[PDB]
C-alpha cells in the first residue's frame, strides 16, 4: 500500500492509533502483521510554490 | 497563566459536548489517559478539573 | 453445638462460596474491578490488557 503523507504523520499510521488520517484515510488492524517504510520525498514530489 | 501558577477551573452541573473539541481539529496534540476519547460523549462524570 | 460436625461442612461451603463471590470485587491490577465500565470507558486496543 503506497501513498504520500506529511512527515509529522509518519508515526500516525500504526495499529491502535487515533487520528483523522487513521480514521478516514488508512486504518491499520489491531493485529497488523507486516512493515511500514517511509522516506522523505520533498526533493522528488514538492515543487516551488 | 504560567505553569507554576497553572490556572484551575471547576466544571460541574452542566452538559458537556466533547465532540466539538475533538472535531475542531485546531489542536495539534490531543491524547487521553484512562478513557477512550471517542466515548467521552457517552460518559457521566462527578466533577471535572480544567 | 451438638450437631457441630454437620454445621461445619455447611459453614465451610458457605464461606467458600462467599469468598468466591467477593473475589469479583478485586481489581487484580486493572483500573476498575467492574467489567462494563472499563468496556464502555476504553477502546479495545488498550482495554484488552
Swiss-Prot record, chain B:
Effect of residue 24 to L: In strain: Omicron/BA.1
Effect listed in the UniProt record for changing residue 29 to A: In strain: Omicron/BA.2, Omicron/BA.2.12.1, Omicron/BA.4, Omicron/BA.5, Omicron/BQ.1.1, Omicron/XBB.1.5, Omicron/EG.5.1
Subunit (UniProt): Binds to host ACE2. RBD also interacts with the N-linked glycan on 'Asn-90' of ACE2. Cleavage of S generates a polybasic C-terminal sequence on S1 that binds to host Neuropilin-1 (NRP1) and Neuropilin-2 (NRP2) receptors. Interacts with host integrin alpha-5/beta-1 (ITGA5:ITGB1) and with ACE2 in complex with integrin alpha-5/beta-1 (ITGA5:ITGB1). May interact via cytoplasmic c-terminus with M protein. May interact (via N-terminus) with host bilirubin and biliverdin, thereby preventing antibody binding to the SARS-CoV-2 spike NTD via an allosteric mechanism.
UniProt function note: Attaches the virion to the cell membrane by interacting with host receptor, initiating the infection. The major receptor is host ACE2. When S2/S2' has been cleaved, binding to the receptor triggers direct fusion at the cell membrane. When S2/S2' has not been cleaved, binding to the receptor results in internalization of the virus by endocytosis using host TFRC and GRM2 and leading to fusion of the virion membrane with the host endosomal membrane. Alternatively, may use NRP1/NRP2 and integrin as entry receptors.
Descriptive protein name: Spike protein S1
Lineage: Viruses, Riboviria, Orthornavirae, Pisuviricota, Pisoniviricetes
Interval of the full protein contained in this chain: 348 to 397 of 1273
Amino acid at each position: 500500500d503506497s501513498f504520500v503523507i506529511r512527515g509529522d504523520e509518519v508515526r500516525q499510521i500504526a495499529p491502535g492509533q487515533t487520528g483523522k488520517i487513521a480514521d478516514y484515510n488508512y486504518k491499520l488492524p489491531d493485529d497488523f502483521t507486516g512493515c511500514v517504510i517511509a522516506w522523505n520525498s520533498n526533493n522528488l514530489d514538492s515543487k516551488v510554490g | 497563566a504560567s505553569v507554576y501558577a497553572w490556572n484551575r477551573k471547576r466544571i460541574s452541573n452542566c452538559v458537556a459536548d466533547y465532540s466539538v473539541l475533538y472535531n475542531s481539529a485546531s489542536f495539534s496534540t490531543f491524547k487521553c489517559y484512562g478513557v477512550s476519547p471517542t466515548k467521552l460523549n457517552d460518559l457521566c462524570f462527578t466533577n471535572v478539573y480544567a | 453445638s451438638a450437631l457441630g460436625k454437620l454445621q461445619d461442612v455447611v459453614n465451610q461451603n458457605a464461606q467458600a462460596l462467599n469468598t468466591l463471590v467477593k473475589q469479583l470485587s478485586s481489581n487484580f491490577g486493572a483500573i476498575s474491578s467492574v467489567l462494563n465500565d472499563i468496556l464502555s470507558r476504553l477502546d479495545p486496543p488498550e482495554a484488552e490488557v
